[PDB]
Every structure is written in C-alpha cells, then in structure tokens.
Structure 1
Amino acid sequence: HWIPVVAGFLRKDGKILVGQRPEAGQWEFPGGKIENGETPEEALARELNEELGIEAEVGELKLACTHSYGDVGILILFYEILYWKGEPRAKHHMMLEWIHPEELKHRNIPEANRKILHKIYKALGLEWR
C-alpha cells in the first residue's frame, strides 16, 4: 500500500523554500499527494498553487525515494521548479521560509528527507561537505 508524493525545489538567490507543517511541526518541501488521474507534474503544479498561490511550471525530475511509517509506504518524487508567476504566500503551512540549504542539516525534516539529505544536496547542485 503506497502513497506517491510530489515535492518541489524552488530557489531564491541560493536559498530554498521549505514550509512548516500545520497539524507535524516538521519542515518540508512544498507539494502533496498525486490524486487519481493526474501525472506527477499536474499533481505538483496543483499542490504548489493551492499551498503557495503561485502558477508554477514543473521542471526536471531530480530524485525519488521511499519511506515506511508502519504499514504506510510513501514514495516521494522531487522536481526542480525554475519558473512560476507571483510570490509564494503561506496558504497552508503556518510558516514559509527561504533558508540556506546548509540549514537543512539542523532543521527538523521528514525522516524520508533526512535519510537522503546528501542526494538532495547534489540534486540542488551542492556538495555534502
């Protein structure tokens, strides 16, 4: 039993966009579940819109990973988001931040992201140091 998730990398002068989960406390890349019928891209442009209020174009696929929370299995696809209309506003996360990507190392993020943090860094054109 799987739940496919899509997530995007938006950048701003090097910094990356994470959002703070509402109802949990963790920071994460904007995105959400693929609904029945939609391509990953469609799901992501939609989630970016309803979470951020932006009209995003979905770029290259960067990474995929899996994670288990019990009998629950998530598959996350991460996509580079270069192009969008407007500026992201917090519609769903009780906070949004542009952070230095190095900060991920000491932000509370999904264990699914934590375990592949290095892969994420490369995908962002960076070095795990």
Structure 2
Amino acid sequence: HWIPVVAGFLRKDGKILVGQRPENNSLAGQWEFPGGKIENGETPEEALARELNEELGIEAEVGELKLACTHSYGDVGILILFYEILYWKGEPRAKHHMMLEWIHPEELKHRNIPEANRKILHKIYKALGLEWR
C-alpha cells in the first residue's frame, strides 16, 4: 500500500519551518516539514491546505509543486509531494508538534530528520533556491 503524503515549505527571511514529531505518534523527535496523509476524495493542494490548518492553525495558499520522492519505512510505502507555501493568514503554532522552529536551511544537515528527507536533502536544497555543495 502506498501512502501519499503532502507537505510544505514555509519561509521567514531565508529560514524554513520544521516541526518536532511528537513522542506518541512516532518517528519521534524528528524534524519534518508540516503536512500529512491525503484523504480519500481530496486533491494534493486541498490536503496540504487542510493539514497546514490543523497542524499550524494557519490558513495557507498552496504554491508550486517542487518535489516528489518515495521511501520505504519497512513495508510502509510513502510518496511525499513538497509544495512551496508563499502565502498564509496568521502565525503558526504547535498544535501537533512538540516544538516548531524556523531554522536556517543549512542546519538540516545536522538535525535528526526522516530518512526520506535525508536521502533527498540535496534535491530539497535546490527546490529552496540553494546549492547542495
């Protein structure tokens, strides 16, 4: 079974927004981009819009699709789509994550993050308007 996930890139003077995965639903303590599973019936955009609302409290406008990749966490097959999020109402707050943080993107290189992101960190940096090395 494939699990299509959508997730977003939010931005603050070059910084980027990540959330600390909470301790009970686990890839615990790992830093990710906000987003989640697409529900039966919805489009990718609708799903991100919604996930961003329910996770950050923000009312977002979903921008360009930047990236897609696959990963296996065992038998569990996930497909992430990453979207640029230029525009929203309100400021985000930790409705789901342990912490929210605006970090320099460079810092991702030494932050505990999903192997699905770790494996494409270069592709990510590019999609953000930065070079890998």
Report the TM-score, using the length of structure 2 for normalisation.
Answer: 0.96
Residue deviations 1:23-79, cap 9 Å, x none? 311000000000000000000000000000000000000000000011110000000
CA distance in structure 2 between the partners assigned to 1:54 and 1:27 by the alignment: 19
Question: Shift of residue 6 of structure 1?
Answer: 0.4
Structure 2 partner of 1:92: 96
| In structure 1, C-alpha distance between the alignment counterparts of 2:74 and 2:62, rounded to whole Å | 31
Residue 21 of structure 1 pairs with residue 40 of structure 2: no
d(CA) in 2 for partners of 1:97 and 1:31?
15
1:11 offset after TM fit, Å? 0.2
Tell me how far apart the structure 2 counterparts of residues 127 and 71 of structure 1 sit (CA, whole Å): 33
Separation of aligned partners in 1, 2:80 and 2:108:
17
- For 2:7 and 2:108, the matched residues in 1 are separated by 15
Post-superposition Cα deviations, 1:59-113, rounded to whole Å, max 9, x if no partner, equal 0000000000111100000000000001001110010000000000000000000
% identical equivalent positions: 100
The residue that corresponds to 1:3 in the other structure is 3
Report the Cα distance in structure 2 between the residues aligned to 1:97 and 1:25, rounded to whole angstroms.
13
CA distance, structure 2, for counterparts of residue 72 and residue 99 of structure 1: 29
Unaligned runs of 5+ in 2: none
Deviation of 1:128 (Å):
0.7
User: How far, CA to CA, are the matches of 1:68 and 1:40 in structure 2?
Assistant: 20
**TM-score normalised by L of structure 1:** 0.99
Q: Aligned pairs, how many?
A: 129
Whole-Å separation in 2 of the counterparts to 1:113 and 1:77: 11
- Give the distance between the partners of 1:75 and 1:116, measured in 2 at CA: 13
SS at match of 2:45: helix
* Aligned equivalent of 1:113: 117
CA RMSD of aligned residues (A): 0.5
- Work out whether 1:47 is the aligned partner of 2:51: yes
| 1:15 Cα deviation after fit | 0.3
Q: What stretches of structure 1 of length at least 5 have no aligned partner?
A: none
